Amino acid sequence: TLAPNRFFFMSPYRSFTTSGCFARFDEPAVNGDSPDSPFQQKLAALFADAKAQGIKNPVMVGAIPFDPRQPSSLYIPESWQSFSRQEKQASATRSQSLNVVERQAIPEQTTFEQMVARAAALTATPQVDKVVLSRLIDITTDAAIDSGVLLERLIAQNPVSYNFHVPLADGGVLLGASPELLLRKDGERFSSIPLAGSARRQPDEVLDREAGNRLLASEKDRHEHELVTQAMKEVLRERSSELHVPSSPQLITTPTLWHLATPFEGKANSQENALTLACLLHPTPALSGFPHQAATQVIAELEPFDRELFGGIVGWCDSEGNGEWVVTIRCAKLRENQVRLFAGAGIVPASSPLGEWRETGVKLSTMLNVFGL
């Protein structure tokens, strides 16, 4: 299985692992949409240094937190190794039986439901339209957790998603099956596929198609979604030479959920790379809200924890400007015998406190399934 000190990224674009560590890069990504930012300037310096020291085709990999004024968890590895996503899907079980010493919802149901009610109340006012609220599950086991076994189970349960495994500076691992592309850049073209709006999958094909059709006709979820795509369209319109965005979202699936999705396909100029555009977008109203600053204030006032890397982005950038960044969701941080799971939900005036408790619950089940819980 995969050692915990290696980066792993599985995607229809590039799928690869890494080995070694040439240089860690913890510069905050704030203002990274600007080529003149210290983030971009130091990124460029570090790539030039890697090549000067004989690293061919250097890549920058890792995770950027929800709040990009915080330090990043990025690094250049010594080497990288492509693999076939299709072959991995075909190949991908247990090694240990784990006991649960403690399991704690943070916050608990009544508290989260009151948070949702407060956020919904705020979204009824002119000052904010949408706020994404989140919660955690902390689990302590009695034995160190085999992150490599977990990764293989994660892939087998989520063969199609953007599956990642990120070594962290504190010895932990960030692992997840993200369904949400934030920014892919491949030559001059770029894409983004925001997700917002959720309905539970059903085991029967008839009920399942009905859930999807219900989601597409749901005013609440379509509103929750259009607040994301309108904000993104406005920003991207001024930094793209062409941009195609469909008028309506389409249905996509994970193993647990239907989501509404809108693809963005654009062309960018020579000033841009995968991280300038990813930092321009991140976080969208899928993960913070709209307007962004007002939403993050409400998040800070209501969540009894710091998100850190949760709700950030994870992926990679090379020295030519190509890269891929996905939203850090359906994910967990683990270290030794401790695990933290994360899930959020976009709150609007039509949100129900119980409904959003349940929505975040279904989201948490992706990683609960990986652990066998």
**Residue 119 sits in the site that holds ligand ISC (CB under 6 A):** no
Least CB distance to ligand ISC at residue 92 (A): 22
Choice from 182, 196, 299, 367 touching ligand ISC (CB under 6 A): 196
**Residue 193 sits in the site that holds ligand ISC (CB under 6 A):** no
**Residue 287 sits in the site that holds ligand ISC (CB under 6 A):** yes
Query: Distance between CA 326 and CA 63 in Å, rounded?
Result: 10
Choice from 68, 197, 212, 289 touching ligand ISC (CB under 6 A): 197
**Residue 261 sits in the site that holds Mg ion (CB under 5 A):** no
- The candidate with the shortest Cα–Cα distance to 328, out of 342, 312, 346, is 312
* Catalytic status, residue 130: yes
Give kind and range of the element (H or E) at residue 120: helix 109-123
* DSSP calls for 196-252: EEEEE--SSHHHHHHHHHHHHT-HHHHHHHHHHHHHHHHHHHTS-SEEE--SS-EEE
Partner from Mg ion, ligand ISC, none contacting 74, C-beta within 5 to 8 A by type: none
* DSSP structural state of residue 171: S
Give kind and range of the element (H or E) at residue 267: strand 264-267
Instruction: Count the site residues for ligand ISC by CB under 6 A.
Output: 16
From the list 121-129, 161-169, 193-201, 241-249, the region that binds ligand ISC by CB under 6 A is 193-201
- Report residue 334 as tokens: 């683990």
Residues β-bridged to residue 227: none
Choice from 55, 286, 299, 348 touching ligand ISC (CB under 6 A): 286
From the list 9-17, 24-32, 45-53, 189-197, the region that binds ligand ISC by CB under 6 A is 189-197
The amino acid present at 199, given as its one-letter code, is: A
Partner from Mg ion, ligand ISC, none contacting 317, C-beta within 5 to 8 A by type: none
Query: Distance between CA 7 and CA 5 in Å, rounded?
Result: 7
From the list 84-92, 288-296, 311-319, 341-349, the region that binds Mg ion by CB under 5 A is 341-349
**Residue 198 sits in the site that holds Mg ion (CB under 5 A):** yes
Least CB distance to Mg ion at residue 220 (A): 8
Site residues (CB under 6 A) for ligand ISC, limited to 327-366: 329-330, 343-346, 363
**Residue 179 sits in the site that holds Mg ion (CB under 5 A):** no
- Cβ proximity to Mg ion, 159 vs 349, nearer residue: 349
Buried-state track 223-254, b at ≥16 Cβ within 10 A, e below 16: bbbbbbbebbeeebeebbeebebeeebebbbb
- Cβ proximity to ligand ISC, 70 vs 254, nearer residue: 254
Instruction: Check whether 125 is labelled as a binding-site residue.
Output: yes
Least CB distance to ligand ISC at residue 180 (A): 5
Catalytic option among 42, 56, 78, 180:
180
Structural contact between residues 140 and 101, judged by C-beta atoms closer than 8 angstroms = yes
Q: Is 65 helix (H, G, I), strand (E, B) or coil?
A: coil
Partner from Mg ion, ligand ISC, none contacting 287, C-beta within 5 to 8 A by type: ligand ISC
Query: Distance between CA 259 and CA 226 in Å, rounded?
Result: 13
**Residue 302 sits in the site that holds ligand ISC (CB under 6 A):** no
Site residues (CB under 6 A) for ligand ISC, limited to 136-175: none
* DSSP calls for 314-346: EEEEETTS-EEEEE--SEEEEETTEEEEEEEEE
Choice from 62, 311, 346, 353 touching Mg ion (CB under 5 A): 346
* DSSP calls for 68-90: TTSPPEEEE-SEEEE--HHHHHH
* Catalytic status, residue 42: no
Instruction: Check whether 224 is labelled as a binding-site residue.
Output: yes
Catalytic option among 27, 88, 108, 130:
130
Q: What is the largest CA-CA distance in the chain?
A: 59
Query: Distance between CA 88 and CA 155 in Å, rounded?
Result: 8
Q: State how far the alpha carbon of 176 is from the alpha carbons of 121, 156, 162, 326, in Å.
A: 32, 12, 8, 10
Tell me the binding residues for Mg(2+).
Answer: 123, 125, 128-129, 224, 359
Which residues of the chain form contacts with ligand ISC (CB under 6 A)? Answer: 132, 180, 195-198, 259, 286-287, 329-330, 343-346, 363
Would you name the residues annotated as active-site residues? 130, 180
Tell me the binding residues for isochorismate.
Answer: 197-198, 224, 286, 330, 344, 363
Which residues of the chain form contacts with Mg ion (CB under 5 A)? Answer: 198, 345-346
